[PDB]
Structure formats: C-alpha cells, structure tokens
Amino acid sequence: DVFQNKANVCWAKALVPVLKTAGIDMTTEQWNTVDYFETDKAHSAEIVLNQLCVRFFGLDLDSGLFSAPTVPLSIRNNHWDNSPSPNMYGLNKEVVRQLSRRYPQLPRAVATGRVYDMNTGTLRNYDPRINLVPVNRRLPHALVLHHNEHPQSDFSSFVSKLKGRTVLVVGEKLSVPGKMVDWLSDRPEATFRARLDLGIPGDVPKYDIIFVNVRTPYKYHHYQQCEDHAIKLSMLTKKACLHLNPGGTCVSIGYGYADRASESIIGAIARQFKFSRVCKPKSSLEETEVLFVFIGYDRKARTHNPYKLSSTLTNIYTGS
Ligand SMILES: *[C@@H](C(=O)N[C@H](C(=O)N1CCC[C@H]1C(=O)O)[C@@H](C)CC)[C@H](O)C(=O)NCCC
C-alpha cells in the first residue's frame, strides 16, 4: 500500500519489521525522502537502515542501537526479505538504556517511532533535515563547509591522460580521445545496456581502465550525499575489480567516505590495487566531488592505511 507502483523497493518492505522494533511506521511520503524509493531503484536494506537510524535517532549502526538479533535482513537472488539468516537487526534496548543517561528522551523516541532531535533533546515528527550526521561517529575526514549547484564536471581530459588502451565508461556517456571506449548505461545507445542499480553485468568483459561516471545529488548535507552514493560504489566501483586486466585502473566519482559503508567499501577496493589516491582536478566544480583513483589491480594480499586517503580528503575539502 505504501509500496504502490514500485517494482524494486523490497529493501524498504523487508525493513518494515526491523523499523517497527523502534516504533517506526514509514508513510509513502516519508519513504519518498529516500532517493531510491522515490526513483524506485534496487538498494541495500542495510545502508537504508543506517540512513534511517541517523535521521530518526541521530546515531548510526555502530552505536549498537539496532544490534538486537530480532528480525533477519536476507538477500536471495537480488531480493531482500526476512527469511531466516544469521544477519539480524532490531532495537537493542540495553544500548537504549546505556544511551538514555546522555539522551533522556531517546527511550520514548524508540518506543513511539519519533525523531530524537540531537540539538534540542526533544521529539519531532519525521523530517530528514533534523539529524544530518551521526553524533557517535568520529568522521575520518573533514566535510565541506558550503556546497553550491554547479554544472556536471567534464572528466574527458583527465581520463584521456590515464595510462591504458581500453576504457569502460560506466554511467553518463564520456568521449575519450585516443582510447578504445565501451559504454555501460541503461540508455539504449550504450555498448552494454543494463540497469546500473543491479551493478556491472557479469558478462561485461575486461579493460585496462574503468571510469565510473555516476553522480549522486546533494540534498541536505555532504554526509547525506556520501551515504546515498555508497550503493553505487558497491554495485559499480567494487564490481569493476572483476572487469579489469591485471595491473588495470579503476577511477570513480565519489564524495569521500563520511558514512561507515563508503569507508568499508573504499577500504575493500583499495587492497586490490598497488596505488590508491584521491584527486580533485580543475574540471571538478561541485565542492563535495572527488575522484577515487585505483591503479595497478593485482588481486594480491595487501594492507590499506586509510589515513592516506583520509589525509588527502581533509586537504581537498578544507582547502589545505
Ligand atoms: C528487490 C525488489 O524490489 N523485489 C520486488 C518485490 O518483491 N517487490 C516490489 C516492491 C515490494 C515487493 C513486493 O511487492 O513484494 C520484485 C517484484 C522484483 C522482481 C530489489 O530489486 C532489490 O533491492 N534488490 C537488491 C539489490 C542488490
């Protein structure tokens, strides 16, 4: 009923019983504040739970707030449901007890599915603007002070100066002088036509260079833009590692890793490459936008020091 005229929102349907442990009842209109519900795209129930946890209670899942194993979130055949699996979530009321000393109204918030306003400590009706960052999370890098609405960046010049012969562009069409270009998009004039929300098709071949030319809209905060881009890093940028020639390069649009999922996904990708850096060329106008650059894919065993990329991201976003 709240899911009327939606083909791909099973993640939201599977979340209903998890959210109900914290008294939450999402209306269609409230669901519509999640971008991928509004545009009806496939998603991670887990990332959306973390997004909703922050908006409602001002805390992300590393708070332990939904760490009670009450309701399963299970993915069978690209379909999220509540079928038994050892991946279970639900309001953890011992954590609510621990948190209540610092946050007195929080127990009532999670009992009645109301927003705990981390500024006032008072209860509000659902509004995605009230809690913009998780207060429990120590951000690995600085976020931009101000954001502006700029035209889309043109990365044609940056990709043309990368080393390699065969490019796969994923998302928005990109011209690359001097290289062989295949194009992955849901546009019908694409070399490979597919839904990008289901990820890189397994049957896509291997390349020297993969460029993820996929953007995510800014709405409320750098933190929001980042967590909304997290599923694209997972479905496109991470899967690109299966589509690379040995020593190949993956470059991806991104917004840092303000959220836990982005930080984990970026760290998992980085271990597959000899070199990992964050670049912001002159072409990149939108202030939150960076390029993640992964060079020398070799599927070796290697340790990743996140402080390297975090340092670079802090410099870029603070203008240091
Ligand atoms: C999963 C998805 O949306 N699956 C659909 C589904 O079961 N729906 C549509 C919306 C409510 C629910 C229902 O009516 O029971 C199914 C009909 C599509 C074949 C979605 O594709 C997803 O997020 N996959 C996981 C992404 C990795």
Numbering used by the authors: 468 to 787
Extract from the study:
The Venezuelan equine encephalitis virus (VEEV) nonstructural protein 2 (nsP2) cysteine protease (EC 3.4.22.B79) is essential for viral replication. The nsP2 cysteine protease (nsP2pro, EC 3.4.22.B79) cleaves the polyprotein at three sites to produce four functional replication proteins. The cleavage is essential to replication and the alphaviral nsP2 cysteine protease has been validated as a drug target by deletion and mutation. VEEV contains a single-stranded positive-sense RNA ((+)ssRNA) genome and is a member of the alphavirus genus.
To examine the differences in inhibitor specificity, the CA074-inhibited VEEV nsP2 protease was crystallized. Here, we determined the X-ray crystal structure of the CA074-inhibited nsP2 protease and compared it with our E64d-inhibited structure. While the compounds appear similar, the regions occupied by the inhibitors differ. Notably, the two inhibitors occupy different locations in the protease. Notably, these two inhibitors occupy the subsites which bind the most highly conserved residues of alphaviral protease substrates. The histidine of the catalytic dyad rotates towards the inhibitor when the active site becomes occupied. CA074 makes 8 h bonds to the enzyme. Rates of inactivation by CA074 in the presence of 6 mM CaCl2, MnCl2, or MgCl2 were measured with varying concentrations of inhibitor, Mg2+ and Mn2+ slightly enhanced inhibitor binding (3 to 6-fold). CA074 inhibited not only the VEEV nsP2 protease but also that of CHIKV and WEEV.
